[model samples]
Target chain A: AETVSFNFNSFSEGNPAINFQGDVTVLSNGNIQLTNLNKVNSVGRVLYAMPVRIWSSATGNVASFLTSFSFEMKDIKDYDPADGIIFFIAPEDTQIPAGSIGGGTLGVSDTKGAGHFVGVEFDTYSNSEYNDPPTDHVGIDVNSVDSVKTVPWNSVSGAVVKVTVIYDSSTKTLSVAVTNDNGDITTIAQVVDLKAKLPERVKFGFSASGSLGGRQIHLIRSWSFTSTLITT
Target chain B: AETVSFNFNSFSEGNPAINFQGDVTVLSNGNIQLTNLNKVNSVGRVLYAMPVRIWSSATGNVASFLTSFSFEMKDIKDYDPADGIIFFIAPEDTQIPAGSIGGGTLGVSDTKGAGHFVGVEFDTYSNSEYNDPPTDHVGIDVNSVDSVKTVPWNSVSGAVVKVTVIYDSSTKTLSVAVTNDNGDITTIAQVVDLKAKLPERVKFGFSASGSLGGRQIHLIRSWSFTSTLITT
Candidate 1:
């Protein structure tokens, strides 16, 4: 797979950041491959957020596709927080709000829904009353405010977790799968469709935040996305 | 605590078969105990089906002061072959149906509903599609055929299962409890004001049947009763 790499050693002076390293290759198949070696943290309004961009030959029109990604972390150190991972896809013109803090920055806090972003968040902290059984899980946020669905985390510790997101533009069907500890991959959540909810050709990246007594660390080894044109 | 014991093995042959050897014990304080060893397939049906007699006091009127009792079982076999254990309390004058086979015995097969009998059955089989599940569970039967409720079996493998049937003569309430593996018991079903449905004194015992490689084995260790005078 064609791939690009990034490393954010220091985002801002005193605030760490990372930029996309290596080559930016958007395949003719409309697949964006991102490979990460070092940690990337955001500061300022984008604190603990991934500050990266993707360039595609396709029009700003949105399309639907599936995703397969993998990553690993060596030392998830202090400053570790529940400001976990997010998968975002939005239009390039959409500017994500800054320094929203906690889950608010990862498209979950945007109430106005201005950015037209669909985010798959691996949220570890308890944000809403509905998140029960009190475990880390995945959630779908549209324009960042409305929660479509949240699934409990059922993965093994230190094991590679493979996640696949399938979006069918025609039917607007969206679903996600995660590999369990036993290596059995199961569908965790499925939404009927997303076309009517989120626009095509959107920006995609990761975001995170920290809180008091929330010094946590996170790392992404690699990511990939594939999009198909909607005939309808 | 006042205690009473029923020894079925003391009954003569050709009489209704009864054996309380499986440790169905009644304590000094009105509490009955039963331990299901999960061995020796046994069915403790009343020798005669109708008006099976149960006398707490020989001179006492059977109907006047009988208030409530608790029926319990453990180490129950899984529900298969469409059969299960039953607790039947029949009127004092009813006759045991002769050669009562399968559905015909225990006053269940009779369609007339002439006899006054209340049966709490752990029925695994489904003769009629009356709110039955595909596994072993409990049910309440009136005149043998009318089923009030069928609860699905939720016992762990090789775990001790307990059921407490409390009947309040004042309100005629009947409640059932299924104890957890950790010994915590919870009431899964209840019937309020059952006096109108079952008014007369009734006989009580365990009955089980089998189906399709599933044998109905009910091993009950003990049982007890408590009563307060009911006001018209």
Candidate 2:
């Protein structure tokens, strides 16, 4: 059994674990800004530099993982916030897909054959074409932009949100808990087969997008993650 | 180059990374209860099961590390909170030494020839012989329970405290930041040579003690640690 993990209370200079993509940048206050508040039609992403082994081919065993982070979402332009952010697990060759710079896509290409990924989306804007809820919501998406499950989550009013996600190999369950600054909590869970949906080794990280006039900033303050894989 | 890390948002049944010692136990809510509330004169400790390589003798380069955790301390017996808790680094063979159960020792043997250790203590009681501040405090100790530097920390009125510790090998500095529930923060830093004070490989964990009549309970809500050793 081997465990791989990383913790960032705040981003720092020359940290080796971070790989920024698209418009992502670390702010002066050590928070990761996924999209510039002044820049519209923007997309940003950050991935762990190294791929993580989630399952062993020889033993057919998947890993259990725990991750937590502090984040804030705000409409800086006094317009309605568009798109939102995602914590995603994707294939090793994943990149910021084209056509992912606006609302609804959440930084993943909705066009089939662009890429393969599984993600938990904390969506702010509702897009009917993608079957999003009328309110800001959280969703579990696989392969396509359409989520298999969605839960309403409109309570964010520029409050820093604390989130914890856990995957249990024994039950093949993925669970997410979201807590607002006001201490309100929302939880959701689903059973999924990661080995069948993703590759043995995968890249995991965060992504976000902004709309043209509706500018929103996605900032992550802290993150901690761990995964254990048993091989015999 | 390699990075070793682990994170526990909260302990659960049969987590592989935790190794308990003395009276430590995981509560039903997944927090680790370091000292039993009802049992007086208690000593509890927990260690990462594997030894961590702090330095490579061949390369002569030390690793940089980061660790963060959430904890709370309170007196159950209403007399006074005795002793406190420590985040410590010791030789691989380190164990709870005799005469280490009381307030003054902070779970390290003050007596000569018992063991070699370096620790950051969150002390509650004022013990004069150890050079502790009259007020509750934090101290950085090397080899002995006598702290090399101490800072007052009396703000823990049963509030959950968040602590982050970072060690930079290039600068040879260790820094600590503690934030209480009320948003107050205390910080301390020290420059030291770890190669001279401890071995190349070390064991790192938490240790705590409670008094007979002045019963105090120490609970750790979460822990995250990461270290990077460049062997090239």
Candidate 3:
């Protein structure tokens, strides 16, 4: 097998760019800005310049992957800054569905389910439909908006934090780790059988939607991924 | 065989970051500061990466490769900054030979041949020992410190420029392109057989050294590598 690696520098200069649905684009500031704040009824999204399929491995076994990146959400105020973002894997052509609201869902799946999906959400605003707390948190989702597990509400807004999401078919685990401004890393792991929640081939990307939040921005600084196993 | 890709958020994070000699760490700026212009006489490097041997598949013997990245060289002066950097491939241990110097050697080779090596250099200061120009320029080297080809120096200092390097086994060419400060594109191409200069299999990485040249910083915004063939 072969290992291919890509580091996104910009959208125009060979940066692996797949799709950006709503408010997503290579920002004027040289960063991928998702869901610009200050505007209601606006959603922002951007997928890996390509699909995120690391190979299921040839021996009819499980394939695992690691995805990590850093982001900033400038909301020093209350959760009023709006809906957050989600790093997700769905069918190859999965968008924010058709007409879904913002918060809680993080623009992916929330109450019912996403046909084939697995997501790690950076939750800022709590929603009753999602049974979320009133503060910011990290969530691991399997098909549904409700997180299978959460690591409490920590303020991620207004700070540059590192988010790492890992999935291993060996154990059917999806782990989420967030390192705050203080270098304090918090982790949450769950048995998410993605083989059942996602497709044999899937796409990876980030989606976000916001409400009346005045001016909150999600900026993705850098990201990387590796496969533990791939189907030949 | 398959092609897998991973991005490097940090050396020790999830990516395969092994041997590094000096201050090659992710900085607070989110970019990887390869050389601490702030520090003198240093070595910053990474290797044992996507093995060049990854190619050589059933369809071919030596697969071509493409390596691209964006970096910024800050400030321009002398004494404090008399050296530069090199992206190279060397056989055997594949790591920098102990007791090697930076600058005209571009941190990979100088004076004599760097046995079984081929490289692309972004030379800043002129080193009569290596036939470097007085200004900054890009050079392609094979087995030795002297450049097999060179382009008159240009201004890459104090600006963020995107650099793309390609190696085509089919054409036996090594080409480099950079986006200058004025948003101009400068390119250099040379027809050289890497199979003769490099080994059948080798490690790839970036190496940099800084002397007194006053102060110069080499910051890597992003980088990616992909091969045209697989070992399978």
Candidate 4:
């Protein structure tokens, strides 16, 4: 494949088609809401309507890809916030996990055998049972809810968290760089074979959830993704 | 009443009177070892032998204090690391929490009724059960294992982690600032009524632990504490 790319500064009356599910909605201002107000145990997901080729079947080579987005985990409740948002890539036929919901799940399946996706999570709640960090964090998940690596994220400040994720096929490393509102930047990386875990064509999207006890409003202001694969 | 302070650049034998317990040891080279190499399920604690007046009983006012330390979380083991180190203040008679050990406890008791201490933790492991941030971090704990506030700390770099903690009695606020090996500085603050939570006199110390599954070497190169209480 040549250059596969797409960009969205804001949702704005549906110029770019997005498949919204569960509690997700494109508000009047255009930004997408991954969770609703006063909704407990609510899960939401939004994905690009089309699947993009991620690897070449003929050459057995994977594409180098980059994804960037701006989001906020707004603390709307007086109580502690629950759950987080995730940028995930899954099989073309993937949908929200039926049994996955609430703080620990983050709308991604926690069931062991149901793990068929790769994700980058911007998590707020620390689910001890599932080995989440106690504070807000950025983590890379490979075919499981447990993250392979994590970095402390400054997402509690009510500021926009701008993120860029890059995957280098040559090194088989996926790296995430995040810039906070205060201009503080943090980077975390992990090595994984995406070709072994995911299909040649994949669907990319965002998933978020609210807990039964606490809640956080997740909002996506903008997003973009680009990929380059070897022709030969 | 007056300025009370102490400093230790390194722990040489026959110097400061420190109460060592569990896996703690003062090596021949002068550094203090909070956890030993290849130790599993290990817990250690060292306290300043003398009690310091944290508040004036005559005036019912708390003292403004500062504590500084240099430490390292050396990943000597090839396996994942467990637990962290904590700088804590408790009642003059406070001893190591008997049931507190391992990664989640960090040598501090997790049992709710045993909550009688305030701590500033340089935590490497995230115990989602107790709400730890996923990344290594600096956190302020008020009479409980869960931190009231936290900022990410970079301790995995094999370099020294320098920390300074300050408490402002007037504002009832505690603040922690950490500078990593890369010269990156992160600060976090929280407010609490110290006079109400603690007694007039207190013992300050460091506590550390290693987990059953993983281990990290904890070493303290130096430590210092100073305080000024209202004479009125």
Per-residue CA lDDT of model 1 for B20-44, tens digit only, reads 3222333444333322233233223
Off by over 4 Å in 3: A2-4, A9-16, A54-58, A76-79, A110-115, A213-215, B1-232
Candidates 2 and 3, the one with greater lDDT: 2
Off by over 4 Å in 2: A111-115, B1-232
Alpha carbon lDDT at A166, candidate 1: 52
**Predicted chain A of model 3: TM-score relative to the true chain A?**
0.86
Per-residue CA lDDT of candidate 2, range B1-232, in tens?
4466877777743444566877889887777888766666677888876577787777888999999998888666465687788899988788878666555676765444124888888988877676678898888878766788988887465889999999999998999999978898998898877888888878789988776765577888888898987754
Task: Report residue A6 deviation for candidate 2 (angstroms).
Answer: 1.5
Docking class of 1: incorrect
lDDT of 4 by residue, B31-129 (tens): 577876556778888888888888887888789999898876656436566678888888888766766656667777754413788888888888888
Over all chains combined, what TM-score does candidate 2 have?
Answer: 0.54
C-alpha lDDT of all candidate models, in order: 0.41, 0.79, 0.64, 0.77
**Tens-digit lDDT track of model 2 for A90-201:** 8867888866655677777653412488888898888777777889888887875678898988647578999999999889898999997878898888887899999887
Q: Write the per-residue lDDT of candidate 3 for residues A160-218, one digit (tens) a residue.
A: 88888777777888878889998788898889776666655566777777775533677
Cα lDDT for residue B161, model 2? 93
Candidate 3 chain B least-lDDT 10 residues: B9-18
For candidate 4, lDDT tens digit of each residue in A18-62? 788788876433358887756777888888878878888899988
Q: What value does the lDDT take at residue B63 in candidate 1?
A: 22
- Reference-based lDDT, residue A232, model 4: 71
Please give each candidate's TM-score: 0.36, 0.54, 0.51, 0.49
